[PDB]
């Protein structure tokens with residue numbers, strides 16, 4: 001989540017306030033500035049797992065092309081779900097399956 | 112046989128099916144006769160030759 | 161999509177129109193383009209609101225009227241298309257449907273004839289729709 | 290498909306443990322290969338840290354720019370490749 | 375009702391070729407060109 | 417490094433064509449048009465994306 | 481719409497587009513501004529529909545900064561008019577009005593060609609960039625040309 | 628006999644799918660999981676025929 005400016009709306013850039021010795025978020029088209037809630041400024045994940053759980057929707061159970069399983073839902077204990085392996089398109093992606101209960105829509109595995 | 116169709120080899124199978132019949136194993140002999148699914152897969156391999 | 165689908169199956173929308181719901185990508189695409197290659201299929205009843213479910217919509221009564229040429233108060237191929245028993249699908253819509261290979265595969269069965277061919281087991285999904 | 294065929298000296302070639310030692314010395318390992326994540330903090334006090342996670346680590350250890358570069362190594366790949374901090 | 379047999383499937387297919395034949399994609403395409411497409415191009 | 421480029425633009429004053437030279441100094445964001453004939457000089461600011469057609473356009477508007 | 485930058489090579493990994501009858505590729509942000517939506521915060525609101533994911537935002541970071549100095553509609557349209565390099569001496573008073581035709585017509589003409597409907601092209605442009613990054617983020621396979 | 632050997636080969640392919648999806652499959656040197664998975668299934672089916 002990146003933050004811009006509520007007036008100018010330009011993407012605010014992080015800049016240090018040397019005199020008070022605190023981190024600010026400054027604009028570049030006007031004089032607006034505000035205090036930083038997070039010392040972290042940037043993160044780079046080399047060994048990443050983001051996106052695998054990204055593809056979750058409410059109508060996946062209406063797709064008749066998906067295979068159906070008997071797995072017990074932890075929430076409602078229904079005997080009717082669709083399942084699918086990971087939608088992550090990496091070459092090293094695992095083949096472990098995700099099951100989606102058609103009632104509460106929770107995602108679990110067989111581990 | 113590759114997943115030409117989104118996550119399946121033919122529209123007569125469900126998605127994410129890696130079983131023998133799904134990815135081109137022709138169980139029958141030429142004497143017995145091939146099923147329609149097997150037939151197309153055999154024609155794909157034959158075309159490549 | 162159910163409403164739109166029913167308009168094509170009655171004739172209100174031209175039968176060659178494609179109605180494609182891609183659920184995963186959250187996209188709904190409709191094509192009235194010229195030049196799409198399509199083929200006809202039997203419609204199977206999929207709505208769990210009737211005893212009809214799991215069977216072919218087409219019955220011997222339609223087959224009876226086809227051989228006569230007239231209804232019992234011209235009746236040919238296109239009469240079937242605008243009465244909801246056959247529809248056209250193109251390559252894009254074909255991606256989202258589940259097709260049985262023969263009418264006999266719509267219902268589970270009760271062999272060991274060493275001459276005849278083996279039918280596939282189909283045991284990866286417990287119940288097909 | 291460029292490929293080398295690397296025969297080993299006889300005394301080493303009949304002892305699988307010594308051959309594994311040769312294996313790890315030849316194989317190229319970069320820092321990128323073992324790094325799981327990198328981070329950039331604003332840590333203005335050089336003797337402390339806003340990060341509660343590295344509190345007990347840096348406080349006991351200690352007993353310039355305010356920007357901090359914090360990189361995390363993956364334990365599994367570091368253990369397999371036999372590399373120490 | 376009853377089940378659709380193999381012979382019944384060929385009755386349906388017979389109705390298709392009775393109405394459309396084998397070259398209707400050639401003829402209908404050209405017919406649409408004379409009726410409408412020429413006019414629109416003008 | 418500076419870029420010294422010849423162009424096929426017509427000088428707005430002496431009217432000699434193919435005699436305007438453009439010197440683009442990106443280190444200081446300063447572009448320079450020069451004639452080779454009457455040698456009139458015109459300076460204008462340039463970015464990193466600019467090309468001889470960008471400052472020659474600014475020269476047409478600076479006259480009118 | 482081409483995504484430059486190779487794996488750990490190409491430095492700034494920005495995105496430029498190609499327009500009919502214009503010489504060299506123009507960065508995406510510039511054409512967004514040139515259509516009447518200059519506000520950055522609005523630009524990102526047209527492309528990415530998930531503010532939560534950093535990755536679908538870190539890759540658009542260099543595109544903002546390489547098109548930051550173009551801060552309004554008029555200087556945006558002007559730059560496009562200079563890219564074409566047709567009839568040297570078009571001027572700003574009119575070189576804008578020539579580029580407004582290259583944006584209204586030709587560029588995505590299947591959506592519409594009447595005036596005062598630039599909201600559809602801006603929304604569509606954001607969709608394209610979204611699809612481009614999904615493939616670059618390995619969240620979707622590249623399309624199969626033989627489908 | 629012929630039908631049995633093909634039936635038992637389809638079962639072993641099921642076991643391989645189970646193992647690979649429950650993280651119980653041995654990784655072959657130089658190969659990712661999906662390569663190793665695809666490799667083992669191919670070897671089984673050609674030996675079955």
Ligand SMILES: [Zn+2]
Pocket residue numbers: 005007008009010027028029030031032
């Ligand atoms: Zn501002």
Ligand SMILES: [Zn+2]
Pocket residue numbers: 073075076077078101102103104105106
């Ligand atoms: Zn549930």
Ligand SMILES: [Zn+2]
Pocket residue numbers: 427428429430431451452453454455456
């Ligand atoms: Zn001059």
